[PDB]
Amino acid sequence: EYRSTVNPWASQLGSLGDIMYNSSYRQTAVPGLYSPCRAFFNKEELLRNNRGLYNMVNEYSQRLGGHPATSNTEVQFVVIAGTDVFLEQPCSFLQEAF
């Protein structure tokens, strides 16, 4: 409560961390790479958990977590198959990092 932010180059709306990372995530992007910090910046995803708690726990388990990464590959690509991959990730549930 003793300061608003710890950096003003990413926490603001028009900041650099929103410019170079937060556009709307599309599966059919022509680069299609996975940036791991996009789960903290997506304005749609930051208010995708605006729904109630039980209706968040149902959708965290019922479908795959938003902004996941493909395993068993060389470089971490974003998911496009979704067939045989299954993974619970808290990063799109609590919006922090360790």
Partner: protein, 50 residues
């Protein structure tokens, strides 16, 4: 190797291949099993495809 004017926070992600434990209570759901139905779906001259 001098410091620039800014500092950076690397952000990564990690795959942890766990081995999960599904528990589910007795008689939670009531499932309705249908009788199986076979159907020919592609019939070329060399091999039908059921």
């Amino acid at each position: 190797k001098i410091h620039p004017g800014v500092a950076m926070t690397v952000v990564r992600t990690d795959e942890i291949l766990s081995e999960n434990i599904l528990f589910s209570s007795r008689a939670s759901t009531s499932m309705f099993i249908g009788t199986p139905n076979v159907s020919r779906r592609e019939a070329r001259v060399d091999a039908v495809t059921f």
